[PDB]
Paper text:
[name] is a genetically detoxified mutant of [name] (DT) that is widely used as a carrier protein in conjugate vaccines. [name] is the G52E mutant of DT, which renders it catalytically inactive and thus nontoxic, without the lysine adducts and heterogeneity that result from formaldehyde treatment. Wild-type DT has been described in two oligomeric forms: a monomer and a domain-swapped dimer. The hinge connects the large module comprising the N-terminal (catalytic and transmembrane) domains to the C-terminal (receptor-binding) domain.
Here, [name] was expressed as a soluble, intracellular protein in an Escherichia coli strain engineered to have an oxidative cytoplasm. The purified product, called EcoCRM, remained monomeric throughout crystallization. The structure of monomeric EcoCRM is reported at 2.0 Å resolution with the domain-swapping hinge loop (residues 379–387) in an extended, exposed conformation, similar to monomeric wild-type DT. Three internal zones are missing due to disorder. The first zone is residues 30–33, a surface loop near the active site, and the second is residues 39–49, which form the active-site loop that is only fully ordered in wild-type structures that include a substrate analog. The G52E mutation site is well ordered in the present structure. The third disordered zone comprises residues 187–200. Based on comparing the pH across known structures (including during protein preparation), it is likely that maintaining a high pH and avoiding phosphate were important in maintaining the monomeric state observed in the present report. The dimer conformation gains two positive-φ residues, Gly383 and Lys385, and is more compact; the Cα distance between Tyr380 and Pro388 decreases from 16.0 to 9.8 Å. In [name], the side chain of Lys385 in the hinge loop is more solvent-exposed in the monomeric structure (SASA of 91.6 Å2) than in the dimer (SASA of 2.4 Å2).
Author numbering: 1 to 29, 34 to 38, 50 to 186, 201 to 535
């Protein structure tokens, strides 16, 4: 009955029920459908995650957050599961028409409304989160009044700075990114005017050389720069952890120079996509052993300045770019974004690192099925299923490029709206495309890193279009392929891959 699917401990009627909604750029200049449902949440800071430009999700401008209020009485109906078939079954609804259309009917409101004008559904927001998500009917949502909470397009704020500084209120790392940006330019100029740095630059081959020669030179560049008095703070931190050594630092800058071509360099979104899948970012960001070591505006600016100049030096040696301009422009802008992402994770409670089944370990990552049942993909019914996978990493921030998922035409499709990754409770949706008729690749809409203290739940959601059973000879994929960082070996690109094998059953 109702009781198997409604959580009565979280259900109630409120007058002037209010929640938060993240708005896309341009909106701030009521509520109207552009998603077959209007989503809101009790958490103004997580709302900020619905707000980035759908066309440039990693790097593009964030819009804002509004508070939306229904006048009169609203029933909040908390659900114990998010499976549409189960809900329709046990609430005794039509098993055919969409759940959210039915939720908007006179009859549903009378049956479940408890005297309210409308019903909103409530679900848990994500693994690792204590937030609530509300699901609203579009037509009903037209009654909402709307008040501005924050506009991230506010003049004077440069990147996604306004969004991340707002989100940092949740918390703690609370840096002024305007100060960092100003200080970064200042530090670059100081390094460029420094006699020893000028001397070191003139020692550059300044032409294509071996990766070994490049690294040797860049290591010396790193050491010379750390002796500048304006990098004294970064010098002190650098000596406290082997992650921050010149050799590791040099290795980041080489890898950057190797992957940035001119098409990439001239686009911030592409630059951010490329940088976000590289290993070894903890060496530059000062992150190791479960803590942010580069934790002031001074140290951050000093490391970004130095990495900028080191990328500039690396490009002639191992890169394919004619200009050095990338190093000062899109490189800095993109890396600032990555710092903000990782800080945001470290400002949140660590999702449990405890694998519930024996983990598979590879390349510093560990992955496991949440439960046996998660590893089973059932067949021979129409409808949805959800499957949880825990992802940790041992030490520095390691990226998750995305996930490779099986598909079978009309028997197993990825539900692109419910599939997501939650990093310390930050819920990040996915963009998914077919590699072919058998495999879909899903990439996070914000950069994902895991590391010590930053752990994730990957939630894969499938939809079945028909009631016929998947046949043994239809199974291309034995596994879900989680994709980690990309390494450039010879000149070829290899992704870290961690596979979890599943079983098809009736």
């Amino acid at each position: 009955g109702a009781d198997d699917v409604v959580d009565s401990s979280k259900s109630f009627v409120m007058e002037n029920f209010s929640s938060y909604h993240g708005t896309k750029p341009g909106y701030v200049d009521g509520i109207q459908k552009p998603w077959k449902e209007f989503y809101s949440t009790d958490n103004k800071y997580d709302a900020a995650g619905y707000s980035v430009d759908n066309e440039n999700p990693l790097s593009g401008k964030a819009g804002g957050v509004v508070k939306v209020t229904y006048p009169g009485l609203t029933k909040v109906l908390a659900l114990k599961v998010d499976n549409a078939e189960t809900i329709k079954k046990e609430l005794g609804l039509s098993l055919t028409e969409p759940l959210m259309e039915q939720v908007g009917t006179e009859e549903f409101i009378k049956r479940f409304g408890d005297g309210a004008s409308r019903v909103v559904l409530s679900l848990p927001f994500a693994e690792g989160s204590s937030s609530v998500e509300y699901i609203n009917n579009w037509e009903q949502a037209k009654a909402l009044s709307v008040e501005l909470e924050i506009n991230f397009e506010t003049r004077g704020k440069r990147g996604q700075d306004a969004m991340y500084e707002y989100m940092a209120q949740a918390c703690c790392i609370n840096l002024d990114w305007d100060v960092i940006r100003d200080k970064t330019k200042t530090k670059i100029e100081s390094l460029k005017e420094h006699g020893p740095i000028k001397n070191k630059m003139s020692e550059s081959p300044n032409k294509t050389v071996s990766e070994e020669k490049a690294k040797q030179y860049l290591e010396e560049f790193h050491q010379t720069a750390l002796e500048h008095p304006e990098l004294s703070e970064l010098k002190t931190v650098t000596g406290t952890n082997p992650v921050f050594a010149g050799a590791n630092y040099a290795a980041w800058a080489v890898n950057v120079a190797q992957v940035i071509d001119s098409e990439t360099a001239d686009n911030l979104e592409k630059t951010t996509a490329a940088l976000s899948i590289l290993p070894g970012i903890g060496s530059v960001m000062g992150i190791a052993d479960g803590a942010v070591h580069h934790n002031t505006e001074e140290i951050v600016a000093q490391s970004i300045a130095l990495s900028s100049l080191m990328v500039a030096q690396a490009i002639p040696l191992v890169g394919e770019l004619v200009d050095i301009g990338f190093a000062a422009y899109n490189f800095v802008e993109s890396i600032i974004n990555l710092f903000q992402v990782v800080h945001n994770s470290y400002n949140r409670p660590a999702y449990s690192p405890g694998h519930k089944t024996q983990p598979f370990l590879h390349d510093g990552y560990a992955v496991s099925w949440n439960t046996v049942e998660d590893s089973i993909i059932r067949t021979g019914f129409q409808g949805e299923s959800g499957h949880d996978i825990k992802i940790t990493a041992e030490n520095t921030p390691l990226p998750i490029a995305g996930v490779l998922l099986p598909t079978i035409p009309g028997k197993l499709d990825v539900n692109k709206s419910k599939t997501h990754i939650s990093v310390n409770g930050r819920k990040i949706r996915m963009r998914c495309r077919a590699i072919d008729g058998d495999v879909t690749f899903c990439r996070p809409k914000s950069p994902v890193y895991v590391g010590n203290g930053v752990h994730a739940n990957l939630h894969v959601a499938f939809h079945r279009s028909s009631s016929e059973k998947i046949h043994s000879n239809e199974i291309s994929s034995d596994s879900i392929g989680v994709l980690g960082y990309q390494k450039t070996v010879d000149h070829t690109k290899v992704n870290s891959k961690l596979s979890l094998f599943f079983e098809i059953k009736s």
